[PDB]
Design a protein around this ligand. Structure first.
Ligand SMILES: [Ca+2]
Ligand SMILES: [Ca+2]
Ligand SMILES: [Ca+2]
Ligand SMILES: [Ca+2]
Ligand SMILES: [Ca+2]
Ligand SMILES: [Ca+2]
Ligand SMILES: [Ca+2]
Ligand SMILES: [Ca+2]
Ligand SMILES: [Ca+2]
Ligand SMILES: [Ca+2]
Lengths: 653, 653
């Protein structure tokens, strides 16, 4: 970077020189009227070239050389090392007229060289490198560069309710581990020359996106000073001489969203005082950029850590069977004593090179009670738009990693249920949809859920890993599979086999295979629901790059309501607890053939040959009947993807 | 694209098949309970494969072949040509049990094949190609693809005041020339089968970005129907059989801006009627994308077309000299009988493959009086923020094409004046800055203008082409050049030479070179203003990739006000009319030496050796004095760049 510093007619000029720049210096304006030629002297650590109309010539410290004065003959002045107290760094120009070789006048330039660099870990190894030349840009991908910031959304200490980033203070040194390091490195003499100061600053716009803290160690112990952030746009830095570093810690306050890309900047400037009432001049400016890490969802193929479960204290069979299932794994079981754990919360995560942790997304209105150390919280509230069932997180899921027409989605794709564009039907609120879209790395896809009364994608589809492989299956609810099976069992002489055996509140209904198959209107309803399922099958195959070989159909059956929307006739088996090879599957209570549920046997016949182990989990017996509603919920918290999100190259927005 | 169509237990299935897709067909669900095997027949134009667990086998129209029934054995059904009235397109499946070779049941699929494609000129040659496979995406660059739309911001007929795009109507067929063509191409039999319709639609969000018209030729002459746009989100298409095309014309309503990227979509869907009260199902959907062309500014290196001039009717010298200047060129002179033509308007342009024209940007509050056929209008109004002098378009300029550290800016870079970040000074309103940024192709740079009372970049800098070359110069105001020259003339014995000769209202002041050079406070002020100029010089060199060889300094002098801001002491010569090699330069009224202005002679000495021809234009004599204000204005409307904006690859936002 070239910077203009002119000699001044009369008075000598004193300037600060920042390493990594160089000066172009006008010696002509300072020359007396009528002067002919000039000569120069300079000190040891100042490098000086005379540039005549673009041609540069190096000049000795004391020579006698003279050059013709001319507006096109200038100096280029460079310094490679910072000044110390032992420095006299200078360039002196002598002027001569046509008569005589004794100078008629002299113009000086006195320099103080300093190093100033604002440094971040741009190369994303967790350590802060010295002046990464790419630190002011942010690029995606394996070869990409620029520093990353976490939203510091967890809570270090229980005493205050809110997440850490909601204020301007740091209570605990543990909080600093969530933060990105930024070091202002300087080198120079004991003090800056008169009239200069160093200032860190941010834009008003970014002031609600970041906060920046400096650690002091005064007498009575460590304290944390907020130097940039909400209602603080600048901080005047205390300069220390010699080779010095100031360590700062940066937190993100806000996730990427509609209208916020995730990029924020921090600057340092060397400012020069001109006079009272006159703004200070920015002599040198150095900039670093951060990208705030997105919120990321975990598909069922990822290793389970904890199984969160909600039910009533007396649903014993459910608790017993879920415990049994989880005991086959290394997972923790966590129980809260009615669908809220699945509908109100989605467990995501955030990651930066230095740190990562899980973050709960809270569905629009006690889930804030999960907020804790390295367990974060984020939520979106529609300001205007009304919330519907499609805003519940049973309607929010994510695919395994997929490749679609050569385009890779290494983190998978978020899936949310919706209605047809011209339908006037329900849709997840714009505020949540915009949030998910803005995270960018999961490239969300809308499916069609609005044919269901509750309207959730988890009612009709799920994903399971195929054991012993890198692959997965899409599981789809299928009414056609159910009718085929029931018609077979009828043909086999089982038409009088009864559903819901053991649920005493259903006994008077005496629902058999015969009764189901004879119900003409129910047949028509389910043919229509199969059309709805197949529409989704097609969009899933398209948007996930799946073929028929990747799909298994589980028997399902629905009843239609007044809105022509579906609710489960018997428990939906597709919405299952997936812990690697072990599947908790809702117990269907299907027709008993030879004292086994034919639905259970059919499902085992589909899954078991693939190495999947099926456990049927009864959540309804405690209620004595099934009306289409599930009274329990589960949510599995999983390990994050191995693939780092910053290695993705998302499509241009 | 694969689509799911199942045979139905009992009743035959009738379906529409859209060319370019294919069907995967379940024959198992339709099979009677206990059936063992199936066989199939199909018609001539239906291609059928039996797919067993992923392995596909082509099947003849009438064979006798049987396959084992199985959920994993399915049909793949393809058609290469649309149905006509002579078509019976079908596939029929026969089912068999273990005993006997006579079918026990049959399930049919009756097909009607149609072609549906919504086509646009994606390859950007001005003609609408058939189904460009990239039509649903928009990519930048020489190899880029996707269709382009103009904001139709001009006005075809004078009767209504507003720009064409402000309503839902088209009065004149000339308007269609500004619009992009979109053709819905179909092929099929006399009518769609019962229960289907074709519908064009857009999102609510895009409904204020576009409008779409169809031309009818009824008995009494041509009429224009608005089928999509404001408050119309969909249009049901009238289907014509055989091979048919419907031609539509698309206009943009809105420029890219903060919160609008410029991309809009239009869809067509084939919809299936399910029943009353049930949404129609989107059987097939085809999509095209448009990008709305940005507003682009023209630098001084571009060929002049028209010179717009505003002054009082009696400023005769100004009018005479401007006419003389323009007569040396092929330009039109347009005169309006006080700075408004430069401050209130910036002449830009828009371009699409089919059409382009000039578009005026109107500065925030009779410039709307320029609105006319192929002369467009756009403006931005701050809703809240107050307008200052920095919002005037003397503060809005653009560089010639430049390359900066290997990054090319083939359209140049917009330049707007501002204040230092921490200064609390003036800045152009966010609404205009956001607009300029959103055009993206000119990558705006803020300079420092707030040291000037009026605060406009055109007070201190301009660009001129270097005749006979592909190159250009940056011209900078320089106080140091002025002091050097005046000190030389003083030394030469000219100190008593007077400024402002011939301006009678200044005579009593008797301003000479001596009086100027002796004024100590004025010297200090101008040293400070030179610091301000040099700060800009540095940012221009950095952001435009310029060296000292690319810059010429014109003598200038300023007086300071109470805010420590500069106003011109004598007319600013840098703000000049550039018509190729011919430069109208404000007449400075400098000290006369040998009956010529020494400022004029000095400027000629700088410019003339480069082949630039200088004409000094006197706009102040009619006012008898110069107070720092200019009473005339000029604005040159130029030809657009040869380089097409869509060939640029702007940085990711
Ligand atoms: Ca590093
Ligand atoms: Ca805090
Ligand atoms: Ca924390
Ligand atoms: Ca923490
Ligand atoms: Ca969920
Ligand atoms: Ca074309
Ligand atoms: Ca119109
Ligand atoms: Ca028009
Ligand atoms: Ca027109
Ligand atoms: Ca302008």
């Amino acid at each position: 970077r070239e910077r203009t510093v002119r000699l001044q007619y009369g008075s000598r000029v004193e300037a600060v020189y920042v390493l990594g720049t160089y000066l172009w210096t006008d010696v002509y304006s300072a020359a007396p009227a009528g002067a002919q030629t000039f000569s120069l002297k300079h000190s040891e650590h100042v490098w000086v070239e005379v540039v005549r109309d673009g041609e540069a010539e190096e000049v000795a410290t004391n020579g006698k050389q003279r050059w013709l004065l001319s507006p096109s003959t200038t100096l280029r002045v460079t310094m490679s090392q910072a000044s110390t107290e032992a420095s006299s760094d200078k360039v002196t120009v002598n002027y001569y007229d046509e008569e005589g070789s004794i100078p008629i006048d002299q113009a000086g330039l006195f320099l103080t060289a300093i190093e100033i660099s604002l440094d971040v870990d741009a190369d994303r190894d967790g350590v802060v490198e010295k002046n990464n030349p790419k630190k002011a840009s942010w690029t995606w991908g394996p070869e990409g560069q620029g520093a990353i910031l976490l939203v510091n959304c967890d809570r270090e200490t229980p005493w205050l309710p809110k997440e850490d980033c909601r204020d301007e203070k740091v209570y605990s040194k543990e909080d600093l581990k969530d933060m990105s390091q930024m070091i202002l490195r300087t080198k120079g003499p004991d003090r800056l020359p008169a009239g200069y100061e160093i200032v860190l600053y941010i834009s008003m716009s970014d002031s609600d996106k970041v906060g920046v803290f400096y650690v002091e160690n005064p007498f009575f112990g460590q304290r944390y000073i907020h130097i940039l952030g909400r209602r603080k746009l600048y901080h005047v830095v205390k300069y220390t001489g010699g080779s010095a570093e100031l360590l700062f810690f940066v937190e993100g306050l806000c996730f990427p969203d509609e209208g916020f890309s995730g990029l924020v900047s921090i600057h340092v400037s060397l400012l020069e005082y001109m006079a009272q009432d006159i703004p200070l001049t920015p002599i040198f400016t150095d900039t670093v950029i951060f990208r705030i890490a997105p919120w990321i969802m975990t598909p069922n193929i990822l290793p389970p850590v904890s199984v969160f479960v909600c039910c009533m204290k007396d649903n014993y069979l459910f608790l017993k069977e879920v415990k049994n299932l989880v005991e086959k794994t290394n997972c923790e079981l966590k129980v809260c004593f009615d669908r809220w754990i699945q509908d109100e919360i989605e467990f995501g995560y955030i990651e930066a090179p230095h740190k990562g942790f899980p973050v709960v997304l809270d569905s629009p209105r006690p889930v804030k009670e999960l907020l804790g150390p390295d367990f974060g919280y984020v939520t979106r509230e529609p300001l205007f738009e009304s919330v519907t069932s499609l805003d519940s997180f049973g309607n929010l899921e994510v695919s395994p990693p997929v490749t679609v027409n050569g385009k890779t989605y290494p983190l998978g794709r978020i899936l949310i249920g919706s209605s047809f564009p011209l339908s006037g039907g329900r849709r997840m609120t714009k505020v949540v949809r915009d949030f998910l879209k803005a995270q960018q790395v999961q490239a969300p896809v809308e499916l069609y859920s609005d044919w269901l009364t509750v309207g959730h994608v988890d009612e009709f589809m799920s994903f399971v890993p195929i054991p012993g492989t890198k692959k997965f299956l899409l599981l789809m609810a299928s009414t056609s599979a159910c009718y085929k099976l029931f018609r077979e069992k009828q043909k086999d002489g089982h038409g009088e086999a009864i559903m819901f055996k053991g649920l005493g509140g259903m006994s008077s209904k005496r629902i058999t295979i015969n009764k189901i198959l004879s119900n003409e209107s129910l047949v028509q309803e389910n043919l229509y629901f199969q059309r709805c399922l197949d529409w989704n099958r097609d969009i899933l195959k398209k948007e996930l790059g799946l073929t028929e070989q990747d799909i298994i159909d589980l028997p399902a059956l629905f009843k239609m309501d007044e809105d022509h929307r579906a609710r489960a006739f018997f428990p939906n088996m597709v919405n299952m607890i997936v812990l690697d090879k072990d599947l908790g599957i809702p117990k269907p209570f299907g027709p008993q053939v030879e004292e086994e549920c034919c639905l259970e046997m059919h499902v085992r016949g589909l899954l078991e040959p693939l190495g999947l182990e099926c456990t049927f989990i009864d959540d309804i017996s405690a209620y004595h009947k099934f009306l289409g509603e599930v009274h329990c919920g589960t949510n599995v918290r999983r390990k994050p993807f191995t693939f780092k999100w910053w290695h993705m190259v998302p499509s241009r927005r």
